[PDB]
Each structure stands twice: as structure tokens, then as C-alpha cells.
Amino acid sequence: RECISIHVGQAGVQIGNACWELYCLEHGIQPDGQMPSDKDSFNTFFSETGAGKHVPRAVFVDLEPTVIDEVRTGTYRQLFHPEQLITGKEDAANNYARGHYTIGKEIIDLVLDRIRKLADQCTGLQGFLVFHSFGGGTGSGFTSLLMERLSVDYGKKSKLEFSIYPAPQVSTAVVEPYNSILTTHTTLEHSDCAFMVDNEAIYDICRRNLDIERPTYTNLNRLISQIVSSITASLRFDGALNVDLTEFQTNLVPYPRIHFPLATYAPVISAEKAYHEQLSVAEITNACFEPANQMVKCDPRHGKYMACCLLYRGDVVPKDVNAAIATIKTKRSIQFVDWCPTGFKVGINYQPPTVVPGGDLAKVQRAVCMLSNTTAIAEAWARLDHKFDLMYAKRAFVHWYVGEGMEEGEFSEAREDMAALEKDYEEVG
Amino acid sequence: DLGKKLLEAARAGQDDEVRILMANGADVNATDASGLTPLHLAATYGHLEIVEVLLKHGADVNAIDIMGSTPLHLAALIGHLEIVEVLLKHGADVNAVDTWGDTPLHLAAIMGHLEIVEVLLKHGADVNAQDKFGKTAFDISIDNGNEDLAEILQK
Amino acid sequence: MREIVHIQAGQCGNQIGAKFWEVISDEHGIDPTGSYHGDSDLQLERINVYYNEAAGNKYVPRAILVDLEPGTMDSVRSGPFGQIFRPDNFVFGQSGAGNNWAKGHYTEGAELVDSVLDVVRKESESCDCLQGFQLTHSLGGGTGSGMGTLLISKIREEYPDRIMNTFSVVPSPKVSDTVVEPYNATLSVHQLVENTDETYCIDNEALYDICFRTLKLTTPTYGDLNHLVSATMSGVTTCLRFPGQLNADLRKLAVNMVPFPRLHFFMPGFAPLTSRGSQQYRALTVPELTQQMFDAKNMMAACDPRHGRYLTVAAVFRGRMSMKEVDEQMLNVQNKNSSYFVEWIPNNVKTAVCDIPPRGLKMSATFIGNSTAIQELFKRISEQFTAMFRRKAFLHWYTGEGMDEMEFTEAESNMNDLVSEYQQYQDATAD
Numbered sequence A: 001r002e003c004i005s006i007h008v009g010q011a012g013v014q015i016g017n018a019c020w021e022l023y024c025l026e027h028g029i030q031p032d033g034q035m036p037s038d039k040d041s042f043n044t045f046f047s048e049t050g051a052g053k054h055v056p057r058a059v060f061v062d063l064e065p066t067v068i069d070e071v072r073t074g075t076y077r078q079l080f081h082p083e084q085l086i087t088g089k090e091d092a093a094n095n096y097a098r099g100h101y102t103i104g105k106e107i108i109d110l111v112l113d114r115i116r117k118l119a120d121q122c123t124g125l126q127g128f129l130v131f132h133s134f135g136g137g138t139g140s141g142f143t144s145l146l147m148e149r150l151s152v153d154y155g156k157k158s159k160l161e162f163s164i165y166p167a168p169q170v171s172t173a174v175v176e177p178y179n180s181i182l183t184t185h186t187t188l189e190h191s192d193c194a195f196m197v198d199n200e201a202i203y204d205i206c207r208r209n210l211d212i213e214r215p216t217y218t219n220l221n222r223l224i225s226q227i228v229s230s231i232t233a234s235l236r237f238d239g240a241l242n243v244d245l246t247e248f249q250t251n252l253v254p255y256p257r258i259h260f261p262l263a264t265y266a267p268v269i270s271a272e273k274a275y276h277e278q279l280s281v282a283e284i285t286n287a288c289f290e291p292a293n294q295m296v297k298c299d300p301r302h303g304k305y306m307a308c309c310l311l312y313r314g315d316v317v318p319k320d321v322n323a324a325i326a327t328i329k330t331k332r333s334i335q336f337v338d339w340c341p342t343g344f345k346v347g348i349n350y351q352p353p354t355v356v357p358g359g360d361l362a363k364v365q366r367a368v369c370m371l372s373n374t375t376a377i378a379e380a381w382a383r384l385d386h387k388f389d390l391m392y393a394k395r396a397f398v399h400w401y402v403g404e405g406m407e408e409g410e411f412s413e414a415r416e417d418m419a420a421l422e423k424d425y426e427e428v429g
Numbered sequence B: 001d002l003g004k005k006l007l008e009a010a011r012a013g014q015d016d017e018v019r020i021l022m023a024n025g026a027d028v029n030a031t032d033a034s035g036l037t038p039l040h041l042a043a044t045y046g047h048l049e050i051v052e053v054l055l056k057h058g059a060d061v062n063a064i065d066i067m068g069s070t071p072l073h074l075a076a077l078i079g080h081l082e083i084v085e086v087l088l089k090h091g092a093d094v095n096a097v098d099t100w101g102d103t104p105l106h107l108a109a110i111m112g113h114l115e116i117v118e119v120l121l122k123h124g125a126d127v128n129a130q131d132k133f134g135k136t137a138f139d140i141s142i143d144n145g146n147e148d149l150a151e152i153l154q155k
Numbered sequence C: 001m002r003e004i005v006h007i008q009a010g011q012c013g014n015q016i017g018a019k020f021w022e023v024i025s026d027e028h029g030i031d032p033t034g035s036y037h038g039d040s041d042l043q044l045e046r047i048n049v050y051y052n053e054a055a056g057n058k059y060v061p062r063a064i065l066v067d068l069e070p071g072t073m074d075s076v077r078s079g080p081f082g083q084i085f086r087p088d089n090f091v092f093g094q095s096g097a098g099n100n101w102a103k104g105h106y107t108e109g110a111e112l113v114d115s116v117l118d119v120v121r122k123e124s125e126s127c128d129c130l131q132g133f134q135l136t137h138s139l140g141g142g143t144g145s146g147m148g149t150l151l152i153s154k155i156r157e158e159y160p161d162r163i164m165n166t167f168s169v170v171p172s173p174k175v176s177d178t179v180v181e182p183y184n185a186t187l188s189v190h191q192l193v194e195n196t197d198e199t200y201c202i203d204n205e206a207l208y209d210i211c212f213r214t215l216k217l218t219t220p221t222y223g224d225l226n227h228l229v230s231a232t233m234s235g236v237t238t239c240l241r242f243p244g245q246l247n248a249d250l251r252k253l254a255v256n257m258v259p260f261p262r263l264h265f266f267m268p269g270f271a272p273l274t275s276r277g278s279q280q281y282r283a284l285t286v287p288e289l290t291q292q293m294f295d296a297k298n299m300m301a302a303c304d305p306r307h308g309r310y311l312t313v314a315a316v317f318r319g320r321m322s323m324k325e326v327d328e329q330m331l332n333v334q335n336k337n338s339s340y341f342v343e344w345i346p347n348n349v350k351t352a353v354c355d356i357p358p359r360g361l362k363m364s365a366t367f368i369g370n371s372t373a374i375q376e377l378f379k380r381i382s383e384q385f386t387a388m389f390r391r392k393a394f395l396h397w398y399t400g401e402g403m404d405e406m407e408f409t410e411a412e413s414n415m416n417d418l419v420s421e422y423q424q425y426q427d428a429t430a431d
Ligand SMILES: Nc1nc2c(ncn2[C@@H]2O[C@H](COP(=O)(O)OP(=O)(O)OP(=O)(O)O)[C@@H](O)[C@H]2O)c(=O)[nH]1
Pocket: A008, A009, A010, A011, A012, A014, A015, A062, A063, A091, A092, A093, A094, A095, A133, A134, A135, A136, A137, A138, A139, A140, A164, A165, A166, A167, A170, A171, A172, A173, A176, A199, A217, A218, A220, A221, A224, C247
């Protein structure tokens, strides 16, 4: 049962690069697609040609060519279907409206037809994993247009997002709060599960765990791809937890609108510490409840849990996981809502995690990604909504959107949806 | 009517035409529809020789049009330094006030005619004279950030 | 979003335009014949933004040269790079406009505008993905101001989804004591408020003041002034001409700098301020660069930023320097000067860094502010306009060209409305 990954805009494309590079290493696939090791569950993400070439089920889309041209000429110039690397000539100029209406309209049909080509090669297509920024005009506006069209053309298929949530340290546009709220409003009903990636959280982790004083996108993306990989490993390997996209929703999403789980990953160790003492199951599990290791800045102690999955990779004995969990349910004030099993779901993949040559992370014997649905992630929505409110009260910059095929009432409509979402979290909390 | 022709010759700078019309009885103090005299127009358009000849033949150096503008107002606004000098020598009121409350000092300051500002000050221009919004020439120089002008006005 | 079409109109427009092309040609390693003699590939990656590539690795400016006054033709050609421009891109009339906006906008200028539009169309049709136009002109004359704004409006009609950007030189009695210039500038600003997306306000009052009071040049020349202009024009286009993590193009600049369509007049600034042929052991630190960039003395418009509030700011550092040190200094200025940045536009100061410094400097910084203080520049022009208009001096020069006297009142009213709008957002609170 196949999964198709779609990467939209610069952030989505560059993060996709890092992910598929890691995927190839994890499955023993070379940059030209050849795989001696064997020739399996990795077929969910890789098709196979008659010549034994394993090709990602992946589409990359951008409204200008700069970043995708790098994929077309780089290490993996031969990995992807060349027709699944799709570029226009003029980007969305940081404007949701241009990505969704005026510029994105020119290429949406080509993108859907190229996706159809991949879908037609699947015998049991599960759905889509969609990578994109909140802040960009393409990442926000074209993604919501694409998600709208995918819901119509693939009504029964699941759609998962990995969404890059903006931070001022590395942001590019002052209007990123607008683009973030607009795409969240219009994509909410078309997405089943969305893992937000707070650039500020990733930036902080690079600074304090990896000793990188001024992290670049390359630093950020290698860490993000490690975490994405730990999230998608269950789809590409044998395992008992989160084995298809439907189960992501079953396990992590109790109601369709609050479908934003929090990812926490440990351990993150600088590659300069190649002889670090190895951390135990108990230590890496306890680290999953330290806010400093989260992919989104918020405080789960101020919220309630609705779900909690622990995805282990490496030298991890099940009895040690259970003892580590037992400790957590005692020493820790970890409050579940009253209507959810206060149980932790556990998957173990016994292969040790892979690290990419060129990366910043030390190899480790065991790692864990915790996926939890906590009401505390509403703090991230509140931070965005407040920045939206400051500018929108003056109608600052709104004329750029109204001039690009969008109506001013869509701003208020989107913001009311966000208010309802914040209230959704309060009522569960 | 030689008055309308004198008004036109003064504005256009036609010296000989001005001489001829005065020799045939043209009203040196004719006014156009707004009250401008030949001297106003020659002062506005920079015709120094016509200014002097008009002043030689009975021009009222301090005539006002309907907006209270004197010839010195207009010479100071447009920036004709030599004409400013001649008008003052012939008795021009250095502190004449027009309907907007402006003096010649106000107008030279606004337009950045710094040499004319200095001449007006030397002839007793009133640094405390306020326009209808309460502004003196010094206020204009401060509000404007014109440091050269403000220095000149503090002397 | 690659190519820019550059237009230069009138004497001022062609003079500062020529300097621009001299300066960025040198930055991109292009010589006066069009050959690339540089030793870095960063010089060529985005050369197409401003140059067409022709036969035999020769680069030709995408530049159109316009003037009603034929003598401007010859001045450009006699310049160092005068032979680099495409001869068919010279579009010139028989007689200048004599500082008459009406002649530039309505009579002589309107007779020549279609010939300019033909060359513009030719340059535009050969562009891969045209991003928009930049125009250099003065507002105090007749051609650059009157014909310049007519051109803008016409280009606007033909290319409605293309950005229009101007470098507009504002008049000052300190440089030209010609008293109709407030008329021409006010009529022009009326046009620019409606028809351009972004305008760099190059104020001859500020340029003179910098030269006379800071650089100690007792009698500044146009070359002294234009030395400051070309440093500024190079700095504000750096992010368009060299690859940058900021993805810079004219529309993104507009989206991030212009919160309200009419309030699109930028205050530029530059550090270090230098006189030409006057090298000094500069080696400005990053803290000196940051402080000078926000100093009123370094602004190319004669306005005190401390008298208003920054809606948006871009700061472009050029040279080899610590990114971290820049980040720390840039956060410092916002934390100390906190009250000078509007609180209702979060994260409204952007920093860019280009490794490549301008000619003759190891360190440099360029400032682009959308500051409500720019109302001081419009109020200065407005007061001179009003002083003249109330006595109706030289109005016949304009109405004699078919122009109506109500266009003067309308322009003055629109520019005063512009001032009121700046004051409105200067006093607005996030409450
Ligand atoms: N983590 C990460 N964030 C990125 C990357 N590239 C851009 N961003 C972030 O994404 C936001 C900007 O959106 P982009 O993805 O670059 O823009 P886009 O989707 O191409 O849309 P347009 O360029 O406006 O057409 C900002 O918040 C950036 O910080 C990246 O490679 N990694």
C-alpha cells in the first residue's frame, strides 16, 4: 500500500531533499536508485523499475525553479522521476493569494496530472504526505489549493502534512503570520493529521545540543529530516505501530479538527561527541517530556494529553520501555483527558538510527520519537493569531492579497476559524 | 488703454515699450484685475531695468494687490536679489504683511533665498512677525530643519 | 522573476542612471565594451537581472535612455560606459521642456512617449520572466518629472502585473534655486502616489547637507551628490543582483516594505559616508555600521527618523563580517530604540548580508526605511508649493500648455492627504 510524498515551495523541497537522502541510506539505496542489499515494506515509498531502479513516490513542486534546479543537478539528479520535479518561472512573492489564486492556478493542473501518473502506478494507494512552509506564498497558498484539489480527486485517501511554522530568526517575510493563518483555515478540513515543525524550536536545538552558533537551513533540515524519518519509519519498515496512514489518525487524532500532534525527539548529540556515553531507554524516554526537545515550542505541563505514541529505534528491550513508562506515569504530572486511555502506545524498530554523512548528529545506539496530541500545542496557534491580530487590526499589507484574487472577508473568516480552533483546545483542556 | 499695455510690457520685460507708453501718458500705477501694478509684474518676472524706470516715474513702491502682496513680497518670493535691493532703497516696507500673514522675510525663508534673507534682516525685517498660523521665519527654519537658514536668522 | 527594465528620463535621470550602470558594471566585472573580466562566479549568477546577453559573451544593459533635450544623448555617450548602451534604446526629442512639467506631461513629452513605449515593449518582449521596471528621474525639472510620470502611467496600463519602482530625486533650493521646482515635484508626487509600487526618495536637500556639513565640501557639485546616489542605488539593489537567502525581487520588496499602497516612499541611508577620491582607513566595525545606518545624518532624505516611526526597515550589510555580530547589533538597535518601531507590525526589521562589498570598501551597510518621518520631506515641498501657488506666480507657463488650474489644487490636496496618512499611522497604537 503505497504513499506519495509531495513537496511544495522552497522549505518543502529542501526538507524533502534531506528526507529522501536519509531514506535512501536507511534502505540501502544508492543515489542512482540501485539497491544491492535485497530487492518489502520500503516499496510503500519506492517503486521499482524493470532495471532494478528504486524510485521515490515523490513529487516536488515550486513556482520558481531555483531550488528544484538544485535537485535536478545535484547528488540525486538521477533518483527522482524527472517529470515529478515541476517548476514555474515566477514565485508567489511571499503572498498566499498569488500561490493559491493568481500564479498557482497556472500550474495546478499539470501538478495534478503528474500526481495522477504516480497514483496510477499504485495498487493500493494510502494517500499523501505533504511538506510545505506556512510562511511562503507557495508553501501556504499553493499547498491549500493542492489540498483542495486532492480532496476532490482522491476523496477516500488520507493526507498528512509536515508544516514548517515560522520563526523570526530565519523568516523571510513580514506577512508570514497572514500566510500561516490563511493556509491553516483553508487546509484544515482537507488534512487528516499535521505535524508542525517550529523553526524556532529546531533553531534552539541546533544552538544548544549541536553547538551551532548560527544554524543554516542545511543544519535545520538535517535535524528535521531525522525527525520526519522517525515519524515515517513505521510506513517503510515492518512494525506494529502506525503501520498505515489511517492508523496515524486512529492513534493520534481523536477529532478531525484537533489533528496537530507534537513530536519530541531524543537524543540529539553533537557529532563532535563521537564517544559520548550511550543513553539508556529510561534516559531517552524521560527526555521526551522535556519541552527543550520538542519540535514545537509549548509547555505540555499546561495542557492535557489525548494520545501518546513512543517510536523507538535501535537497541531497545521492551521490558526496559515498560519500566521507563511506569516511572513516567508516577514521578511525572502528565495529565490525560478523562475520555482517553491513559496508556502509551509503543513501537520498536530494532535497527539503530541512521545519520547522514555531512550531518551534525552523533550516531547513537537507541533513539525515540514521541508523538503526542496535547492541548498545549494551542499555545503555538495563539502566538501566530496574536501576530495576525496586530497587523490585521490596521489592515496592514492586506491590499497585497485583495489585489491578487482574494476577498478581504477571507481574512476575518480565516481568523474566526482559528478562534474556534483555540476554543476547541480549551474545551478539551 | 495704455495701462493694460504697460502691464503687459512690464511683465514681458519690454523696456523700450515701457519707455514709450509712459511718454504717452500710460498710468504707471495701473492695476490688472487682481490689483497687480506694472511694478509688481516687473518685480515678479525679474525685469530690474523696468523696476528702476517705474520707480523713477511715480510707481508706488508699496502698492498692494488684492491679496496684500507688495512688490517686495514678490521679489523676495521669486528670489530677485538685485530687485529686492532696489525696492528697499526706494522705500519698500520691509515688514509688509499680506493676507496670509506673510512678510517678505517669511517668503525668502520658505524658498531658501538665503542671500535675500540676509538683506531683509539687515534692513530691519521683523524676526517675531507671525503668519496666520503663528509661525515666524525662525519657526519655519526649525520646523524645516534648514540649519543654514536658522543660523542666519540667529544673528 | 528575473529581468528588470531600467529607464532614465531627463538630465538628472540620465546622469544618475549612467552612474548606476558604471558602479554595478564594475561590481559585476563588466567593462565598457560589455566583456566580463571578473574573477568570481557570484558576479554572473544574476547578471541577467540587469543585462541582456548578446553575441560573444558580451553583456548589454537593459536600459532605455530618454530626454526631450538632445544634448543629454551626447553626455551619456561621452561617458566611460556611454558606448555600452544599445544605440536604438536612445529616445530623444528636439527641445527640452524648460523646467515645465506641463510640456513634459502634456505637449512635447506626450509627442515622444510612444517612441519610448516601443523600445520598452521590445525590451519587455525578450525577457524570460520580467519582474518590473525601475525609473531614474528628478521631480524638479520638466522631462524626468512630467514625461517621467506620463511614461509610468502608460507602462502601468500595458504591464499591470509588473512592479514599478522609481529613484526620484526631490528638489532643494540649496542645489537649484529655480522656483517652479515645487510645482513640478508636487504635480509629480501626485502621480507617483497613484502609479508606482515603490519609490526611493533621493532628496537633494539631504545630499547637499551631507556633502557640505559632513564631508566638508564647501561647494558641492552634482558629482559630489551623485557619488552618494550611486552608493545608495548599488546598496538597495544588492539583494537583486547577487544570490541571497532572501530571494529578493521587486515584488517581495514591495510586499514586505509597503503595508499601505500609497505609503510607498522609502528613506534610504548609507554607511560609511565618503567623498570620492578620499580613501580612509575605514574598517568600520559592525557596531559602527549599525549605529550610522540609523543615524539621521546618514539618510538620503532630509527627514529625522527620530521624529516619526518605522513601519518597516530593511538593512543590507555588505562585506566579510560576523553574522552573529550583525544579529546582535540589529537586535540591540530595536531594543534600545524600541519606541521608534511600530508595535503592530511584528518582526518589521529585516537584515540581509552580501559577502561582496562595493568598490573600495571592506565593510558597508545600506538602509531602506518606510518611516512616517518622510512626511517632513513632503511638508517641505508642500510649503514651497503653497507659497508660490498662493501668488499664482508662473502659473501661465502651465495653463498655457492646456493644463488646468484645478490640477494644481488637486495635487496639493493629494500630497497633504499623504502627509495626514503618515501622521495617522505615526500616532496609531497597538492598544
Ligand atoms: N526549516 C526550513 N525552513 C525554511 C527553508 N526554506 C525556507 N524556510 C522557511 O519558510 C518560510 C518561507 O517560505 P518558503 O518555503 O521559502 O517560500 P515558498 O514556499 O517558496 O513561497 P514563495 O517563495 O513566496 O513563492 C520562512 O519561514 C523560512 O524560514 C528550509 O530549507 N528549511
